[PDB]
Amino acid sequence: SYYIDADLLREIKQHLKQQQEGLSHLISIIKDDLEDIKLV
Amino acid sequence: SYYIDADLLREIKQHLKQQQEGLSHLISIIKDDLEDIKLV
Amino acid sequence: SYYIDADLLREIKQHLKQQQEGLSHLISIIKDDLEDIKLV
Amino acid sequence: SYYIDADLLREIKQHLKQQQEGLSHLISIIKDDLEDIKLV
């Protein structure tokens, strides 16, 4: 049978992966601002 | 103690704003798809 | 012959709303921080 | 110039990590949905 929302689920997943990459990028910017800390 | 530039918060908040827009987009398209499917 | 399961989409929508709640809370925390910055 | 405690930034990072967990869980749910649709 044809799953009527197949293309939609694929699109939602792709958007979520893009958003996940955005969060990774944010986390990376934060890590880069903290990376030179030797102690705390 | 360790500190960072306060303006980093504004960069973070800008990206989060965008994350929010992305989530809103996805919620909207799901609501639209559910409306279109008329089960009888 | 189609296969349709609206519960799958409702589940995804529920998770997206939960995500949006968390993201709104984080934005609020950063706005609070930026308010405090302005005052020194 | 204005400086914020590095710990405030580590806290934001912790919330971002929680957001990443949420997106991962949702991506996993969609992936599982799409596997299941193969058999209908």
Per-position DSSP letters for D1-40, written without gaps between them: --EEEHHHHHHHHHHHHHHHHHHHHHHHHHHHHHHHGGG-
Q: How far apart are CA D9 and CA D25, in angstroms?
A: 24
**Are D6 and B1 an interchain contact pair (Cβ–Cβ within 8 Å)?**
yes
Torsion of CA B19, A29, C31, D22, to 10 degrees: 40
Elucidation method: X-ray
Q: How many domains does chain A have?
A: 1
Per CB-CB distance under 8 Å, the chain A contacts of C8 are: 5, 9
**CATH number for the domain including B23?**
1.20.5.170
Q: Which two tokens stand for residue A30?
A: 């934060």
A2, C2: Cβ pair inside 8 Å? yes
Mutating which of C19, C31, C36 best tests the D interface, going by the most D Cβ atoms within 10 A? C19
The terminus-to-terminus CA distance of chain A in angstroms comes to 59
Residue A21 structural domain: 1-40
Quoted resolution (Å): 1.4
Count CA atoms closer than 13 A to A36's CA, side-chain side.
Answer: 6
Of A16, B30, B27, D27, the closest CA to residue C5 belongs to B30
Burial class (CB in 10 A: 0-12, 13-18, 19+), C7: exposed
